[model samples]
Target chain A: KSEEELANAFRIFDKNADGYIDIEELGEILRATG
Target chain B: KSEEELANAFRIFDKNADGYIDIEELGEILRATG
Candidate 1:
């Protein structure tokens, strides 16, 4: 994906816009992948 | 590293400027350290 695209993906994942991917957010997304 | 620092590192690792670290770019950065 493009830089903006990847950034956008992260932006969505980091719901709080805190920058770091918190454990809660990470786990939720991982579960979705499974 | 701080989020900004990590982001900078990721920016460096994402050489093509695509954003995410692909296997090739990840390997390249890893090899540089090793």
Candidate 2:
């Protein structure tokens, strides 16, 4: 419910150390939430 | 009422600041009207 958490989720999602999160990063975690 | 939205607001707010916004930085208060 938090964008900050979502951004933090992005932080974790940036596993490859890229400065930006790609759509694949979003899909992976939101899928995990199910 | 949220920091993240405020952050987005701040991004628009930061148009002229270049980057790295300070917490107390005040200008035209680059956000939606109060």
Candidate 3:
């Protein structure tokens, strides 16, 4: 996949747009993905 | 964010469409996001 697409994906997890994604945000994605 | 959007994010990491993401795939995302 393209970096642009990946960046978009990252933004989804980085809900607060703080340039970092925390464990809680990760948990939300994992649950949804799983 | 919406579950639909989250699922799209998941799909980016789950490149193989095997319903799971491996460490390498995760690494790609982490580096990009970081």
lDDT of each: 0.52, 0.42, 0.60
iRMSD of all candidate structures: 8.9, 11.0, 8.0
Interface RMSD of 2: 11.0
Question: What global local distance difference test value does model 3 have?
Answer: 0.60
Ranking by DockQ: 3, 1, 2
lDDT of each residue in B1-34, candidate 1, tens digit only: 4445555656665666654555455344335345
The C-alpha stretches of model 3 lying farther than 4 A from their native spots are A1-34
Off by over 4 Å in 2: A1-7, B1-34
Q: For candidate 3, write residues B4-31 as lDDT tens digits.
A: 7566776776777765444456566566
Candidate 3 CAPRI level = incorrect
What would you estimate as the lDDT of candidate 1? Answer: 0.52
lDDT: worst 10-residue window of model 2 chain B: B25-34
Which residue pairs in candidate 2 collide?
Answer: none
Model 1 chain A weakest lDDT span, ten residues long: A25-34
Model 1 Cα lDDT, one tens digit per residue, A1-34: 4356556666676677665454454444344333
Model 2 lDDT per residue over B1-34, tens place: 3345445654654555554332222213312222
DockQ, per model, reads: 0.06, 0.04, 0.07
List TM-score (chain A only) for every prediction. 0.68, 0.43, 0.64
